């Protein structure tokens, strides 16, 4: 499967003026366009190589579009402020996300928008395109609203239409790196803690995408205990890392079998000391 | 490709 | 309202002393996403700190990369300082190498 998604962070600044709003579009893992309020250009801006062969009907637009957003946001942060009966003294969060997915056959399988004010689930848009989900009697008045106006059906036209004919495009048009895997570089390290027992971590580096498995095994069965897992982590050049980590007692090193699972990798490697 | 529309919690 | 972000301090490659690098702060699972986020050699402020553009995770935490160009040593101290509204005092944590 792919995905295309749109994230959107408005914060209000009561002291003075309008408030910050950034957004960043993502094909997968690959951020390709970016719009920050507090930036010079005013402009959506490339953030890969493959997205700026598009000409300037397609950059006014997008920045067209991203303004209006940004309005719309400073717009609900009043609106949201009212609602929860708010002072104007305090600065406040709206968060959006929307986006489609294509599956294995490029063909659409999922769309979504969901909404939040302050990090908490306000509003969002069932599975089904049709039909909204109210956190509470805020977002209710809302879905009430939207419901009658019908957003619902311009989102829906654009989640399974437009969306995905576009993600197709840029998918085609960066071929070379969205539909190439980087398989995870991978090698071990042995960390003496004392006379008695060691570290062991297994170590995934520059692979894409994000999504990876590895688990540690004693003598070929499962273990959790001992062990710690850190969050993927970007590497800065579009690559991810990603380490595991299991304390073992010293001499004992060979019974453990670090295994990393990965769309890049035909069949899942392992690892030993 | 950015939604055309961002209607408002409030119209 | 309100979560204390994760710090992951690290290189973008393998570290070798005098072979030019990355020194990359990531700092994840916080709000609200006002942050400030400095690195360190040896105590100091670092200058040319670029970052991420803004996101946020399925939860609605914000992450963001800071990170810097830079050539390890034997000596020198490099750290992650992060200052943030569930904090008490800011937060220092200390490349590893690894990690
Ligand atoms: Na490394």
Same mark, same amino acid.
């Given at each position: 499967?792919?995905?295309?998604? #749109?994230?959107?962070?408005?914060?209000?600044?009561?002291?003075?003026?309008?408030?910050?709003?950034?957004?960043?579009?993502? /094909?997968? !893992?690959?951020?390709? /366009?970016?719009? !920050?309020?507090?930036?010079?250009?005013?402009?959506?801006?490339? *953030?890969?190589?493959?997205?700026?062969?598009?000409?300037?009907? #397609?950059?006014?637009?997008?920045? *067209?579009?991203?303004?209006?957003?940004?309005?719309?946001?400073?717009?609900?942060?009043?609106?949201?402020?009212?609602?929860?009966?708010?002072?104007?003294?305090?600065?406040?969060?709206?968060?959006?996300?929307?986006?489609?997915? /294509?599956?294995?056959?490029?063909?659409?399988? *999922?769309? #979504?928008?969901?909404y939040?004010?302050?990090?908490?689930?306000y509003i969002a848009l069932k599975?089904?395109?049709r039909s909204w989900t109210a956190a509470d009697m805020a977002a209710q008045t809302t879905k009430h609203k939207w419901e009658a106006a019908?957003v619902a059906?311009?989102?829906?036209?654009?989640?399974?239409?437009?969306?995905?004919?576009?993600?197709?495009? #840029?998918?085609?048009?960066?071929?070379?790196?969205?539909?190439?895997?980087?398989?995870?570089?991978?090698?071990?390290?042995?960390?003496?803690?004392?006379?008695?027992?060691?570290?062991? *971590?297994?170590?995934?580096?520059?692979?894409?995408?994000?999504?990876?498995?590895?688990?540690?095994?004693?003598?070929?069965?499962?273990?959790?205990?001992?062990?710690?897992?850190?969050?993927?982590?970007?590497?800065? !050049?579009?690559?991810?890392?990603?380490?595991?980590?299991?304390?073992?007692?010293?001499?004992?090193?060979?019974?453990?079998?670090?295994?990393?699972?990965?769309?890049?990798?035909?069949?899942?490697?392992?690892?030993?000391? | 490709?950015?939604?055309?529309?961002?209607?408002?919690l409030?119209? | 309202?309100?979560?204390?972000?994760?710090?992951?301090?690290?290189?973008?490659?393998?570290?070798? &002393?005098?072979?030019? &690098?990355?020194? &990359?702060?990531?700092?994840?699972?916080?709000?609200?996403?006002?942050?400030?986020?400095?690195?360190?050699? &040896?105590?100091?402020?670092?200058?040319?700190?670029?970052?991420?553009?803004?996101?946020?995770?399925?939860?609605?935490?914000?992450?963001?990369?800071?990170?810097?160009?830079?050539?390890?040593?034997?000596?020198?101290?490099?750290?992650?300082?992060?200052?943030?509204?569930?904090?008490?005092?800011?937060?220092?944590?200390?490349?590893?190498?690894?990690?």
């Amino acid at each position: 499967s792919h995905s295309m998604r #749109y994230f959107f962070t408005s914060v209000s600044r009561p002291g003075r003026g309008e408030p910050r709003f950034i957004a960043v579009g993502y /094909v997968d !893992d690959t951020q390709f /366009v970016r719009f !920050d309020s507090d930036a010079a250009s005013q402009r959506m801006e490339p *953030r890969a190589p493959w997205i700026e062969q598009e000409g300037p009907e #397609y950059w006014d637009g997008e920045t *067209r579009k991203v303004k209006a957003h940004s309005q719309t946001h400073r717009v609900d942060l009043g609106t949201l402020r009212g609602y929860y009966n708010q002072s104007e003294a305090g600065s406040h969060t709206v968060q959006r996300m929307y986006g489609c997915d /294509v599956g294995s056959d490029w063909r659409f399988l *999922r769309g #979504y928008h969901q909404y939040a004010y302050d990090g908490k689930d306000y509003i969002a848009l069932k599975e089904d395109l049709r039909s909204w989900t109210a956190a509470d009697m805020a977002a209710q008045t809302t879905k009430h609203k939207w419901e009658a106006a019908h957003v619902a059906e311009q989102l829906r036209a654009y989640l399974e239409g437009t969306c995905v004919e576009w993600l197709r495009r #840029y998918l085609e048009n960066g071929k070379e790196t969205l539909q190439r895997t980087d398989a995870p570089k991978t090698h071990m390290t042995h960390h003496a803690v004392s006379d008695h027992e060691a570290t062991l *971590r297994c170590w995934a580096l520059s692979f894409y995408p994000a999504e990876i498995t590895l688990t540690w095994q004693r003598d070929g069965e499962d273990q959790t205990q001992d062990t710690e897992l850190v969050e993927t982590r970007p590497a800065g !050049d579009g690559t991810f890392q990603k380490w595991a980590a299991v304390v073992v007692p010293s001499g004992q090193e060979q019974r453990y079998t670090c295994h990393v699972q990965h769309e890049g990798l035909p069949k899942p490697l392992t690892l030993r000391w | 490709y950015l939604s055309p529309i961002a209607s408002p919690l409030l119209d | 309202i309100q979560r204390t972000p994760k710090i992951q301090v690290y290189s973008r490659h393998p570290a070798e &002393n005098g072979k030019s &690098n990355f020194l &990359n702060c990531y700092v994840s699972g916080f709000h609200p996403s006002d942050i400030e986020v400095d690195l360190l050699k &040896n105590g100091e402020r670092i200058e040319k700190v670029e970052h991420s553009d803004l996101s946020f995770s399925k939860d609605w935490s914000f992450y963001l990369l800071y990170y810097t160009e830079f050539t390890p040593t034997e000596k020198d101290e490099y750290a992650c300082r992060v200052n943030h509204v569930t904090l008490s005092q800011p937060k220092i944590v200390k490349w590893d190498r690894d990690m």
